[model samples]
Structures are given as C-alpha cells and as structure tokens.
Target: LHEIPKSEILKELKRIGAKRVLIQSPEGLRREAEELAGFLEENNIEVFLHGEINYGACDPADREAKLVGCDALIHLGHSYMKLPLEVPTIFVPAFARVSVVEALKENIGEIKKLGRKIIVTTTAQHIHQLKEAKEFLESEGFEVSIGRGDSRISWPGQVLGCNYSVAKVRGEGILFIGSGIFHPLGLAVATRKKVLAIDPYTKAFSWIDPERFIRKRWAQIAKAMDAKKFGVIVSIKKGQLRLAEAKRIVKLLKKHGREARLIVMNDVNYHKLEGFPFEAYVVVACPRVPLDDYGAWRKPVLTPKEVEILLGLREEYEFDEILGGPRESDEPFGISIHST
Candidate 1:
C-alpha cells in the first residue's frame, strides 16, 4: 500500500490489510505518483500507479480500472459527482486559489475569534489564485499571507507541486484549498496552526467576506432547432486564443446579415445594450454571459469553427435568413463555405 505521511492512513491500511494500492488520476501527475510509489516500495510495500487519464473536459476511462483492481484505491484530487466510486476511496482535491479562498471563508468565525492572522498556502496549481484571495481577505479586515511554493514553476501546470512543509514554519492558521485537505492538515499538526479546508461547490462562505455569489447556468442547445441570430462578444483574453476563428465566425454572420461585433471584454458591464437591439449574445471564450442565474447557466460549446460549419449547413425547406446581410464572394486565403 502507498504511504501518506499520516498515522490514520497507516491505520486504515492495517485495518483493511490493503496490500496493493492503486494511485490514479489524470496524466498530469505521472512523475509525482511514480516517485511516491518508489518511496513506498523502499518501505517494504507494494504499489501500482497508472496515468493514462484522457484529456478534454471529461473523466478518463482508467478511473474505473483503478477502482476495480485495488484493495483501497487512492483517488487524488478531483470532485467525482454522480460517479459511483465503488471502493474504499481516499479522494483529494487538486488545490487551487478558488478552493483555498472558499476554505478560509468557511472557517472564518473560528479563526477570527482566535485572532489568527491567516497564513494561506496552496499547491502550485493554485499559487496564482492566492493573490486574488489575499486581496479579498485584506478587504475583509483579516490579516493574510502566503508562502512561496519552494520553487518557481514547481510542476507542470501546477505552481504548488507538493512541497507544503515550508509554509508550516510560519502562519498561525493554515488552510489548504486544493483537491484534498490531508496534506495541509498534516502541515498544521507539524506547525501547530489551526488548520481548515474549503470544498467550493459543497461548502464555502464567509460571514465576514460577504461576497455576492454569482450562480452560473449550463445548457446543451441542439443544433437543429437553433435561433437564427446571435450577438457575439469577445474579450481581450479570449481573442488571443484564435483570431482566425473569430474572423471566420464574423464572415459567416455577415453573409446572413446578422451583426457580429467584438467586445474587448466579457465584463464590459455596459447596461445600455438594450439600445443595440439583439435577442441573444454568444461569448466566444466562455465569456460570462447575462442570465437570471437559472437560464444560460454555464458556458456553451459554441466555437468559430462550429459556427462557420453551421452557417454552411444546407437547409431542406424554406428558411428565414438568421444573418441579415449579403456576403462578399471573396474567399480570403482559401476560406470557402460549402454546405453539405
């Protein structure tokens, strides 16, 4: 079994006699898992860790494989909602700034009463996130601080990597918000700080922080019965991803006479949009869109490539043009629309 730096884990292993443990998650953490497995082997334990988890916004196939094979599967760092994690599972959150901020706020009352100036620490995954949370904390009359994650660019796509022992030296209260609370809690015991955690979707708040939580909505709109016209907005951050994709979408929109204008920001906050006269607006980069917290709950899968493809879609019957203008016949640099 793999060994975490805690007696409870050892106790669990002893109780279950879990001889062969499987550590599994996305491919991003292969090296760390390999090192941990090696350490366990040195301590006379058998361990197996796999990292073939797929990409994109979905759980990989091997998640099920790990659950089925191991005596006690150690699932690292993710929120598995609705998935039957049918095993003795020890789950961890992939620590991030958003997760940390939520955790501190949730345990605010206890820490405040103790006059604890929060020393926040997180994994490199959330190192950048601490800045925003720190600013938020300072605004709320709470003394806040953060520890540098041992080294710069600590891990691939993760700033905090796994070395949090350094933060245990200072900070009266240590709160870790990431995939799981086990590691940060361990540090609290060593440093003797009041430790806390926050799981944003499940439990997060601060009576002191007083943030107006923004609820998001998500929906999958079928392509067939779609509305003809849409107002599109682009942000400076999103625009940097692909200019070609945005231009292609604009060309398609203009061909149909529907207007498409690029807004430099998603949070433009210009309330006078009613004067422009448009029914729906699509944000190109998961840009925050307006909704009643119920409708348009989350970002859509709309993309310039997808939008252009839809524009080229052939109609079987008489259809009203969603786009309202005549398009120039010029196909710039081999860009042509063919309906199939």
Candidate 2:
C-alpha cells in the first residue's frame, strides 16, 4: 500500500466545499484511492472512485466527474498539469519518502571525480529528496546545480519521461535521483551530457549513455524524410490535447509539399495506429508517445521537432518535449523545404 495524505485530502475537500467528489488514481495507485475513499466517507463526503486509466496529470477525470455531477475531482499519484480543467481538481502528488542518502553516499566520489559541474534532477516522487541529496553532495565538495523546470513541471529538478527541462541546466554532467531509465535516458538525450542515474529505492547507480538511442531517433527521422504522407496525432485527453500544434504541423507539412492528416484519438497506441495508411506520424499528443513507445508502432513516430529535422529546416537534433508552448515553429528557422 502506498501513502495517501488523508488530512490534506480532507482539508482540500472541506476548502472546496465538495460534498460529492470523484477520486481518480493511476492504475498503480488505485488501491490508495479506495483507502482514501473510506476516509472521505467518514467526513460525510460522497466519493466516486474512477476506474479508467490515468496516464498522468494530462489525463484528469474531469469528464467522469461532470457525468456524475460531482463537485470536484481529486487526482492522485501525479503532479499538476498546466491545463485548465472543466471541474475543480485537486492534485495529490504521491511523493514516496524515498531516501537518496545511500545512493548519494555510494556515488558521490565518482560524481566528484568527474571534475565537472553536476546538475541534480529527478521525477516528482523523489523531488522532495533532491534538496537533501544536493546538500549531501555539496557537503562532499561537489559543485551542483538544479534547474527550475519550465512552466509545465511543478517543481525544480523534476522530470517527466517526456519533459527533461529540469535536467537541461548548465552542467557538464547530471545526477538523476530517480528509479527508472526513462528519465535518465531522456535527460541524457536532451542535454547530450553525461548522466548518472541513482536509484533511491535500489541504492544502485548506472551511467546513461544515450548515443545508441539518439542514433535510433535520427534513423527514424531519416526514414520519415522520404515519406509523402504523415499522420499528425492529436490527443483528445483534456491535458494532453494540442489541437493547435497539430494543426500547425499539418500546415507546415503542407507548405513543404507533404500531405498531412490530423488523427484525433483519445488513446493513441500501436494497436490504434496499426493498418493506418500514413507513411509517418508526427505525434502531437503526450510527448511520450513518439519518444518512449515509438518501437510499438509500425511507422516511424516523431516529435514535432523531428519532423522539422526530416524537412531539413533544422540541422541540430533537439529532443523537443511538449511542456508548455506551441510545438510547431516555436523558434525561427530556415526556409521551408519547398522553398529550396
């Protein structure tokens, strides 16, 4: 069982005057939702536990609450999404009290030996420990930095699988205080810097070399360069949807003499994309779609920036994460491919 802050939940409910509330949690955190429901009932607040999949803060339970006429929705186990919601939402980020002390102790020497400035970053679950980790590393005479992430990220030194803005700080190396390879891999590719992944739970550490992964992405971009048609994926999820960006991509592709169609779907997955006629896909949905799960799809799935690469408008490979602004043409670049 995971920790769910009952007092905070009760206080938030009371403050919002939410007599009837819909409580939703990601599949892994569903058990905590049931536990929290019992406490809500004790306070005389009606609770409906949402059974659908919650991908991230991007997939809030606003529709379920509106359908059931609930006053508010309490989303668990993810940080706050920047999007405005149809229903009053409370984001109870599940912060595990994971200790990074052992991890820091074991790897501090190696990190310091690198003789380069180090940046510390992690996901939300371990964000509470970053300051402590930073302090410990500094005590060992390691120069460390923490990037205050972009608007989408809720905390400094925090990263999502898709968003690695916090790890983009000025440092020759990065120390990722998280559990998985996803964050470290993304950070390494985004920063193109040496990254060490320190797992607080496992008390293990590994160096993340992103050269192979970067090569694969570049290959995918190259393969997509010859495609005549593209399926620009636009998500319908409340927070993940970027219809404007999708449309902008379509326009850009059209200007370059490529045919692009907007593929709007609630769940964009390999099964859903299978048998599609599009030669390539530009995912405007969750940034994870094109980056994390590209191997699952038949066609090459690329981020908006990758599409620009294929069009030869950009020479540098930037792993663009859809954190805040418009994804397409956010920066001034060279002329369209058609112009050349």
Candidate 3:
C-alpha cells in the first residue's frame, strides 16, 4: 500500500522548471508509471514512460531520458543512489503498509523457542514497520535489536540486497521482514547468524539456512583459484559502476602473476561473457551478478571480496556490498538526467 507522492512529485517538477520528464519504475510499480504520466500530462508537463526493466536505483533511466530529450527523470520504488545524474532526478521510494509482526504472528511461538536474542532488519519497502515489529516481538518476551544502517540504507534495520550494514548487530539471530531470499540469504552469509524470513506479501515465515548457498559459492571461489586469467567486469550502469574497485582487483591479480583485463559493459551476463578468453571473472559491479546468477556462467564469477579471499588477502568469505560511490566523485563518474 505504498502510495506514490504525486503532489510532491508535481511540485518538484515545477520547481525544477522541467518541461519534459521521463518516468521509470520497477516492474511491480510499473502500473503507477501510466497513472503518474496521466497526472503529469494533465498538469501540462510532457512526460515519457520508460518501458524497459527498472530493477533498482542502480539501474537509472538517465540514458533513456537523454536519448528521449527529457529534462528530468523520475525514478520510483527505491532510495537515491547518491550518484551524479545527467538530468534532474527525483527518487520516490515506495513504503509498505504491511505489518511484519502481524505477518509472522503464527510463527511467534516457534521463533521464541529458538531462545536467542534477535535483530530485526528488512529492505526499504518494509522499513516503516520495523520498529512496530520490534515492539511486538518484545511484547512476546523476545529481546530484539535494530541497528542503524549505512548511508545507502539510511534507516535503522534496513538492508539492501547488496548491503547489509544494518544487520551487522550483536545478536544471535536476525528476523528479516521482506520478500525474496536474496536479502535474507545475504544477511545470513554476511553475519553468519541464524536468519528468519517473513514474507510481507504471502505472510509466510521460513528459515534462511545458507549452508548450501555458502558451499556453492565456496566451490566457485575454489575453482577460480585455478584460473590464470581473470576478467574484471566493470558495469557502466550509472550507480553500479565500480571502476576503482575493478582496477584494484586487476592490480592485485597482476601482482600475483595472473592476467587480468577490464571488461566494461552495461549488462554483465553469461552470454555477454561467452567466448571470452578469461578463465574466471571478478565482478566489481552488482554483487548479484556473481552470487544470485553464479550458476548461469560457464566460468566462476566472483565478487571483489571473494577475489580478496582467493588471494589470501582475507581469511573469511565476506559478502560484497556495493553502495555506489560517495555522494560526489573526483572524476566524472556519470552525469545526472535531472535539470539540476
């Protein structure tokens, strides 16, 4: 029940003096695109709907806006990337109305049986109710903690798929109130703690046992150790680009007597990497490109952290989290699509 702030968006549109704007939203919120487009049209603001996939703030529509001659870009359903935009961009994050405690009410007895202190964390979508969820769990005689997240998350107990700073709390277990296994699994691996997932949509509860997932990733890393050549994949996606990290990995790999090359592309997939001369790839872009979709590639796709672990630079296997560059960069990272 996250309502898009239409009034605020309209006011910002006028405030920025944007005559033409482009709208982009994740697939779940695509319906709102047409709704908002109609509203903007009625207000005499020219708007275009980006019909392509809008996954996260990392996948901005700045290039599309520039191609369509738009004055600004309105990105919905996620937090701001803090990256430079070629146009005046507005991020309209969607909030969830669902109650995390209510969703997992039936599993309260089971959760309490674990007899461990719990930390509550979730994605931005369900962040608004995290405190309420914490209170309800406390009332159920459970000790719960909600830690503050990083700048990317910007909220207590909030976790992005690529970032789990908030979940790094001094607790024996974590209760993730959000959909999908990605965040919960990543949290389980990142913190090495027991994880429980409560799906707000289905109101279902499940344990996130990442042993198998970790084993698989470990196998990938082991295979990568035998590689003499590595392709350091650097995404050109506005927010996902990690050129510095990629170069750092290249230097490390070369220092170890391995051949490393920079492979720059907008999208990094198995097909795009097929027939490449490299034996393995170190993805410095989206962490999911290596974790979630690792099986799709012929060669092992590893994260920068995994590469560090492979080279003995790190002992423990850590989940790679990318929050993009700082608010501003010394180099021209990318241009905003906003009129700022």
Candidate 4:
C-alpha cells in the first residue's frame, strides 16, 4: 500500500480556503483518491473526483475543475509542471515506500567507478525520499550533488520522461532512484553522461546508454528519408495537443516533396494505425509515448525531432524531451533493418 499524505493535503486545503475541489489521480491511486474524497468531505469541503485518466502534470484537470465550478484541483501521483490554468491546484506527488539504500550499498563499488559526484534524482514516487539515497551516498564518501531544474519541474532533483534538465544542469554521474530507466534513459541521452538507475521496486540497477537509443533513432531517421508518404499524429490529449506542431511537420513534409497528412487520434494503437496507408509516421506526442513497442511496428514511427533530422533541418542528433518553455519517436523497424 502506498502512503498518502493526508496532513499535507488537509493543511494546503485549509490554507487556500477551498470550499469546492476536484480530486484527480492515476488509476493506480483510485483507492487513495476515494479515501481522500471522503476525507476532504469530512473537513467540510465539497469534492469532485475526476473520472477521466490522469496523465501527469501534462494533463491536469484544470478545465474539469473550472467546468465543475470547483475552487481548486488536487492532482496526485505526479509532480508539478507549469500549465496555464484557471484553478489553483496542489500537486500531491505520491511517494513509494520502497527503500533503495540496500541495493545502492550493494553497488557502491560499481558506482565509485562510474564517478564521484553523483547527481541524485527520482520520480514523484520517491522524490520525498531522494535524500535518503543521497545521505547514504554521502556516508559512503561520494561527493553527492543535485540540481534545480526550470520552473516546469516540480522538485529540485526530479526527472520527468520529457525533462532531464536537472541531470543536464551538470553532474558527474547520475543515480536515478525509481522503478526503471525510462526516465533515466532521457537523462542519459539529454545529459550525455553516465546514468545509473536503481529501481527500489525491482531492487535492480541499469546503466542507461545513449548509444543504443541513438543507433535506433538513427535508423528511424534514415528510414524516413526514403519513404514517400508520411502521417503526422496529432494526439488529442489535453496536455499533448500539438496541432500546430503537427501542421508544421505536415507542411515541412510537403515542402520537402514528401506526401504527408494529419492523423488525429485520442489514443494511438498499432492495429488502428494500419488503417491509414502511409509509408511512415511521425508521432507528435510526448518523447517516450511512442517508443514502448518499437519492435512491433513495421512503419517508421518518429518523434518531431526525428522528422526534422530526416529532412536535414538539424544535423545534431538530440533526443526529444519537454523543456519549460512550452511545449513539447521511433523505430523498431529501423533497428532491425539496420541490425540485419
């Protein structure tokens, strides 16, 4: 069972004097939300539990709160990212109780070899206990350090799937305390440094490599060049509304003499994607949304950055990640085609 910070939420609700509020959380935290809804009501506050999927800070229920005429919105399980919203929201990030010191203690030898000054970070599930790992590193005599990201980031050392500015800010090596390397993979690619991720849940550590991602990213870009037709995906998710970018990519494709069209969808599915006849596709969603099933896709699926690379708009290879300024890929087909 995950720990819910009722005291923190209660204090903030009282401070803001919110009479009516909307509580939204990921599916995993449904029970927590139910208990929280009842708890808030007990405190003489009206509560509305959002029924739709909650997808991090990117897609907060600000509009839903406004529609419901609530005083504030409470989003859980993810950290804060700056978004233009009418409602005052409290980002109650959920923390996992998983202890990470034992595993890191087991790997201290390998870590010293990686680097001394470790940039410590984690997901919302463990951001509350980041210092536990940091203090353990200090006790072991490692020069541990952390970085502050831009306004878009919620915590000092927190790393999102689309943002790794904390890692990019500067560090020797990174020890990401979280479940897996999906977030750290972005850190590895963005920071161009040695990233060691330890999963408190799995009791495992993985050194995130930018080389492998780059190799396949390379294949996706190269494969797209030969394709005559392209489909630019426009995800209808509130936070992932990149219609302008999608249109830009579509126009860019036509200018390059390639046929391209916009494929609008609320959810991306391989079986549904096959309905559209295109030689390749450009996923205009968040950086990691489209890469999970890389091996299964036959067409070249790329990020917005990859489309630019394919068209030679930029020569430097940069992995896609969302930064503060607003706004914010590929290719199993590419990896296998090149590997063989």
In order of appearance, the predictions have TM-scores of 0.31, 0.88, 0.87, 0.82
lDDT tens readout by residue for model 3, 26-68 = 8888888899999999999998998877888878888789888
lDDT per residue (tens digit) for residues 84-105 in model 4: 6678877666656678788788
Q: Give candidate 2 regions above 4 Å deviation.
A: 325-340
Model 1 vs truth, CA RMSD: 20.9
lDDT of each: 0.44, 0.78, 0.80, 0.76
Cα lDDT of model 2 by residue, 11-48, tens digit: 86787678998888888887888988988999999999
Best of the two (3, 4) by lDDT: 3
* Worst lDDT 10-window in candidate 3: 328-337
Better TM-score candidate (3, 4) = 3
> Of the candidates shown, which would achieve the greatest lDDT relative to the real structure?
3
**Each candidate's root-mean-square deviation in Å?**
20.9, 8.1, 4.6, 8.7
The numbered model that scores best in TM-score is: 2
Residue pairs in candidate 4 whose N, alpha carbon or C atoms collide under 3 angstroms: 96-125
Better of 1 and 3 by lDDT: 3
Runs of candidate 1 with Cα error greater than 4 angstroms are 1-11, 54-63, 66-68, 79-82, 96-340
Q: Report the alpha-carbon TM-score of model 4 versus the true structure.
A: 0.82
Give the range where candidate 4 is weakest over 10 consecutive residues by summed lDDT: 331-340
